[PDB]
Symmetry: C5
Subunit: 29 residues, 5 copies
């Protein structure tokens, strides 16, 4: 359903952000 | 409908953030 | 209601973050 | 549970918003 | 599960909050 699919999309995108910010932390530290 | 529309707006904004943070990571990466 | 108000607060804060990360990208690289 | 979890998310996102503003301010002329 | 997905989002956002603080400390330190 539309609510479930949107929440899944949010969860996936937040995990992408978490991976990118970890890559930034690795480049800097 | 208000809940569906608001969480869609949140999803779109988070996708904007995901693109920008990747641009930042790439500029600083050797 | 509490759920509606919290989701509104989340949406507003994420928009603030999206603008700050765009300002970081602009300051670093334009 | 749902109300409390989304309140926790709202608070954590406000913490992130403060930290990202600190980063933006340090690098800005 | 809606509750479980929102809990997973809350956990990922807490990871992001920690990582961004580590980045801010390395840049400002």
């Amino acid at each position: 359903g539309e609510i479930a699919q949107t929440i899944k999309e949010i969860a996936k995108t937040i995990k992408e952000i978490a991976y990118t910010i970890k890559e930034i932390a690795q480049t800097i530290k």
